[PDB]
Design a protein around this ligand. Sequence first.
Ligand code: HEM
Ligand code: HEM
Ligand SMILES: Nc1ccc2ccc(CCNCCc3cccc(F)c3)cc2n1
Ligand SMILES: Nc1ccc2ccc(CCNCCc3cccc(F)c3)cc2n1
Ligand SMILES: C[C@H](O)[C@H](O)[C@H]1CNc2nc(N)[nH]c(=O)c2N1
Ligand SMILES: C[C@H](O)[C@H](O)[C@H]1CNc2nc(N)[nH]c(=O)c2N1
Ligand SMILES: [Zn+2]
Lengths: 403, 405
Amino acid sequence: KFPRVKNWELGSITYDTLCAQSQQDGPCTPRRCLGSLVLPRPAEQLLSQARDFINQYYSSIKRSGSQAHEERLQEVEAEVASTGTYHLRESELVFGAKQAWRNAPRCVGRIQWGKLQVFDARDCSSAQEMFTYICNHIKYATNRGNLRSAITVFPQRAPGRGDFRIWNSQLVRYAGYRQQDGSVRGDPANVEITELCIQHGWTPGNGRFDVLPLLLQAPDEAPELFVLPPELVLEVPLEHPTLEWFAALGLRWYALPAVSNMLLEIGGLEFSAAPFSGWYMSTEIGTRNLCDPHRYNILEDVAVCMDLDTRTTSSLWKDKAAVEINLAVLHSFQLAKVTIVDHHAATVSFMKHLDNEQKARGGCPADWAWIVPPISGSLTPVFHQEMVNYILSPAFRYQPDPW
Amino acid sequence: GPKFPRVKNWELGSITYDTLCAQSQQDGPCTPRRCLGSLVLPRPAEQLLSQARDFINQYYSSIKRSGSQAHEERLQEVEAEVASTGTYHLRESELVFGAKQAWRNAPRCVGRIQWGKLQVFDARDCSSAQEMFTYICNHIKYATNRGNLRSAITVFPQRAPGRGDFRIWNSQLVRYAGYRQQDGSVRGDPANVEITELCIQHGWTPGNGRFDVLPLLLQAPDEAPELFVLPPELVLEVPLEHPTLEWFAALGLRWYALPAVSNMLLEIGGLEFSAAPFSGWYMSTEIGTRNLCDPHRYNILEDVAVCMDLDTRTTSSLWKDKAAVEINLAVLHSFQLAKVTIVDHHAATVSFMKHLDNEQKARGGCPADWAWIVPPISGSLTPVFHQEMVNYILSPAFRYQPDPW
Ligand code: HEM
Ligand code: HEM
Ligand SMILES: Nc1ccc2ccc(CCNCCc3cccc(F)c3)cc2n1
Ligand SMILES: Nc1ccc2ccc(CCNCCc3cccc(F)c3)cc2n1
Ligand SMILES: C[C@H](O)[C@H](O)[C@H]1CNc2nc(N)[nH]c(=O)c2N1
Ligand SMILES: C[C@H](O)[C@H](O)[C@H]1CNc2nc(N)[nH]c(=O)c2N1
Ligand SMILES: [Zn+2]
């Protein structure tokens, strides 16, 4: 039965009929909901996913049932029957990559889904070539602070061979150096990748904000190490518009959020290396990256500098510090002329996206726990909006770490 | 590993498995195809007997007399009673156990560390709306306790074959009126427009203020509801001021001390208590973020931001975030000054994490609804944000029920 979906602020109701198109199971059952969990616990199969995708494509260009549509289905059928696999045309790959972003239930930035630069790198045969494609992606996407969304797609998985992989979780990441006494210098999220880098011959630094090299892997070969040229990595020093001591904290963040460990699935084909980038929403940096207790954990430092009463939770010292940190991020990115969006503007655009998709497709898969921002939740319109979460394909998925 | 849900805390890196969800007898709204975890209200002789047996088994397990002669004789007594009357009745100690268990089982409640401390008033002898009012007044006096709040539930007679239900029409024992204006706006609390109009229809002379306490509309079996005015000295309220912003007191804001929810159904062993009002103390974000700042509630964010001289013409000034923090601080400061129990969202969530550890040891899990447990401001600043949770329905339970009108 199709869900009735209510907005509690406005009193409006919609019905999600799009979820009927879901062909893949999520983690929930009638006995228990696992919606808050971060990670998940043959030729006829491939052919039906392929046909479905080809049908989506020809529908998208208003050519369902055309000459071209019918011959393409026959091509895919012939290739799968003979070889167990098939290959996408570039225009199909472009459509597929935009659709995977459109379908991503955890992404609040999907108003932008139609504006995605797609780099075809399926003719890549070595880690060295991967690095060249990656440098061009970063160059294009960064665009001197006028950020532009992009994806680069490396060769698909093949039954015979190992995968193409980027070992790093993002193209730009700060090192996390574990101490002989358990603690971490830098970003604790990156301890393991930092150790792998050193293990593969990288000379580490000893700073809080050391940009990591890339570990890039061509099929069935040890990963190779490539240092990013410093001029390609745009960073923003953090300052606060009114609190002078904030700059003294020596905080900074990189401009480009470029996720590089997710699998892109299109028509049953799997692209194990397909890094994509957009621009940041300020709470990712200001709230999670800087204030998570298991990340840079700066809340106490800032609260102390603001002379707040740290001895009791009821002074709301954590809340006051977090606001000023998020304000510093916004101010600093605006001063540096680097694209950033605040959580109010982003969630308002996402509500417009929900409306657009209701009209276009009869629904929009959305994961409430990820869409609602990590500060000021109920001050944004998405908090009051019921959402239905489900998996459509094309999709971005998690995959195992290659080590 | 084990074939039970694996649950991770991302701050600590620690893992548990929920085995308690195996005891769920009732389906939620989700399927493998789609998750409906974010929806607020998603959509019998033999049946009663099996619910009753299960509940009697839980009771005897809890007093460690499972399989005993007293356990079997109680099962036989319930079977006999049902056989001859179609229903049964709980012993006083079963009702106390069942009420505490319903609170313990409530997945949307962040206050469950307190579950073992619940004063259960047995009002199952009540036979009139006038008497319900007396019991409600007594509950309020006990629970308010001059500002040193005590958790309590008052249980009125269960639903019974044929006979009509006991109902409290109001969603809470204390609610502010919401008066629809000629222009289309609302004076007072917009959440309460419908109950306000019903009170007027049933004969209440309305005021015209922003914080008018509503009368109670109380319904005894097969009777029209009757109107009762709470004596003002029984309704403890807290005027709001801010510790540093001296002008905040001039806004004339206030909130009542006692959150006393009155429209939920208490279900124990298949028996249905349609009138069982219960009360705790407030967590400060309920007042300061939701009731005062929701766009569809008092909606005071912009007024406060304007007084703070913030830039309300652009999202990126974070004016909403700054105003909300100060409003929440005012609530905490004001309740503290008034010596009225309140808990901030950091303290509440820290205690809930302790509750989760206790329940993992006691029962092998704890049903929890992440979207409701994570506070509405400062979510990731609290430890619950980083904790995966498994949501499922156990009974005894507090359940939603349709409006009596
Ligand atoms: C244009 C600017 C964009 C903004 C502001 C944005 C915003 C966000 C945010 C805030 C999240 C949650 C991130 C987190 O908490 O770690 C997210 C998740 C995601 N976004 Fe975007 N997004 C953007 C562009 C993109 C692009 C270009 C793609 C792919 C083409 C994409 C795909 C995703 C996916 C797959 C996730 C979920 C990742 C996961 O489950 O771990 N987004 N988005
Ligand atoms: C002792 C202090 C208590 C605190 C601080 C507390 C805290 C909370 C909070 C903040 C909520 C969410 C409310 C909302 O957003 O509307 C809640 C939900 C709930 N709590 Fe408590 N709680 C307390 C005591 C109680 C008691 C005594 C009971 C019943 C015996 C109870 C049962 C519930 C139930 C059933 C809900 C869910 C309501 C719904 O689904 O609409 N709690 N609790
Ligand atoms: N601003 C943007 C744009 C696109 C994004 C695309 C993806 C992401 C996700 C960042 N990944 C970290 C979350 C995560 C997930 C699973 C396991 C983890 F350890 C951590 C963030 C984005 N931010
Ligand atoms: N502090 C407390 C203590 C106990 C509580 C027990 C229950 C509640 C729930 C308040 N109301 C539910 C909100 C709601 C739900 C469904 C439909 C609505 F219109 C409104 C809040 C509590 N707060
Ligand atoms: C346990 C919980 O699901 C986890 O902390 C989630 C919550 N919501 C989130 N939302 C976003 N946008 N990003 C996240 O990493 C998370 N983490
Ligand atoms: C749509 C969404 O489920 C709804 O706004 C929920 C979210 N979380 C909540 N959490 C609590 N504690 N109380 C609420 O009323 C809500 N509202
Ligand atoms: Zn679910």
